[PDB]
Amino acid sequence: MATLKVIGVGGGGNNAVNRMIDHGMNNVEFIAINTDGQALNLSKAESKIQIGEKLTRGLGAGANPEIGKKAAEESREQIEDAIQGADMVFVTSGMGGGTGTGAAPVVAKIAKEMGALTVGVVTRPFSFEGRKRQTQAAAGVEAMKAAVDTLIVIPNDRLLDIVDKSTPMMEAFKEADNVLRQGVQGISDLIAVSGEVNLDFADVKTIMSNQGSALMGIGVSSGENRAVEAAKKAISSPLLETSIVGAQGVLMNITGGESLSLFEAQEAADIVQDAADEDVNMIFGTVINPELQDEIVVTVIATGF
Ligand SMILES: Nc1nc2c(ncn2[C@@H]2O[C@H](COP(=O)(O)OP(=O)(O)O)[C@@H](O)[C@H]2O)c(=O)[nH]1
Ligand SMILES: COc1ccc(F)c(C(N)=O)c1F
Ligand SMILES: [K+]
């Protein structure tokens, strides 16, 4: 079976890895990469890599992305050894600081050279962090795009659209974490489960390899318009820089119980096709889970923008 690894690079990335481990994911390996040895000592990841100790003496990169980049380059063999064997790597990092900005594209490059299908899931900083952080972050996003197979960007300003004046900051961060964690879980499920119309890791590669921007979404619904609703939730994305609009390739899977109808599978597909507003090249899958009663789940991976 295909081996999935999630790598957190820098403070925000390792935060996301810690919160995902807390949440619980059972068939994914986690790797924590950081300059900051204090944060790395608190990581819940089974594999930890301290990079750049000679450069920083165990401190972070101090907002200097060139130090992050050098620290990763100098630890290339340790990063290779930790990746070796993965079929797919997700690299998550917060752009705009020194370690994520500089080291995450090096890690992603190493993963793609090690043979892994490589997906980046990165944040852009809040506008309140100022224009220099935003410009540094943009350069990291560009570098990440050059290094990955596909890239999901989460502008942190979008979190301000989903909170009220009291929502705890940590609850907002968990919402952003969901993008990665549900994208990972959806792939894990595809690999693990045999479908009635069966998709497998080669289909993931076809949809994701060397594609650029991506969307990864899941929607769950019940009741009379469940397929349309689940499809709409899978592609909605209030947190995403890349919406579904313009997608030219899509992997879509529908999971339901024995009641899953052909008609509602077409409805779901049509929602995705119409929201793309393009002629979508679809890879369509279906899973019948007789455990499920009235629940349906639509998973979408969209690329080709
Ligand atoms: N959404 C989210 N953003 C984060 C988190 N931690 C940091 N950030 C963002 O990521 C950017 C860089 O922070 P950090 O990863 O700590 O910097 P680095 O360790 O030096 O690479 C910050 O400017 C914030 O915009 C997090 O837990 N969640
Ligand atoms: C989330 O996508 C998934 C999940 C579980 C599956 F069995 C399949 C499949 N049709 O083989 C799929 F495409
Ligand atoms: K499968």
Numbering used by the authors: 11 to 315
The authors write:
To confirm the proposed interaction of the inhibitors identified in our fluorescence screening, as a validation of the ligand-binding assay, we were able to determine the crystal structures of the SaFtsZ folded core (residues 12–316)34 in complex with inhibitors 18, 20, and DFMBA to 1.55–1.70 Å resolution. Omit electron density maps around the compounds clearly prove that the three molecules bind into the interdomain cleft, as PC190723,15,25 TXA6101, and TXA70747 (chemical structures in Chart S1). The protein interactions with the superimposable benzamide rings of 18, 20, DFMBA, PC190723, and TXA6101 are conserved. Nevertheless, these interactions appear insufficient for strong binding, as suggested by the 66% occupancy of DFMBA, compatible with its low affinity, while that of 18 and 20 is 100%. On the other hand, the halogenated phenyl moieties of 18 and 20 bind deep into the pocket with their benzene rings connecting to T309 and I311. This last residue adopts the same conformation in all examined complexes, while T309 acts as a gate presenting two different conformations, closed and open. The first is observed with DFMBA, the smaller bound molecule not reaching T309, and with TXA6101. In this case, the hydroxyl group of the T309 side chain points to the solvent, while the methyl group lies next to G196, thus closing the central region of the binding site (purple).
The FtsZ ring orchestrates the assembly of the divisomal machinery in most bacteria. FtsZ filaments form by head to tail self-association of FtsZ monomers; this is followed by hydrolysis of FtsZ-bound guanosine triphosphate (GTP) that triggers monomer dissociation. Cooperative assembly of single-stranded FtsZ filaments is made possible by FtsZ monomers switching between a low and a high association affinity state during the FtsZ filament assembly. In relaxed unassembled FtsZ monomers from several species, a side cleft between the N-terminal GTP-binding and the C-terminal subdomains is closed, whereas this cleft opens in tense FtsZ monomers from S. aureus (SaFtsZ) forming crystal filaments, providing a binding site for allosteric modulators of FtsZ assembly. Binding of small molecules to the cleft between the N-terminal guanosine triphosphate (GTP)-binding and the C-terminal subdomains allosterically impairs the FtsZ function, eventually inhibiting bacterial division.
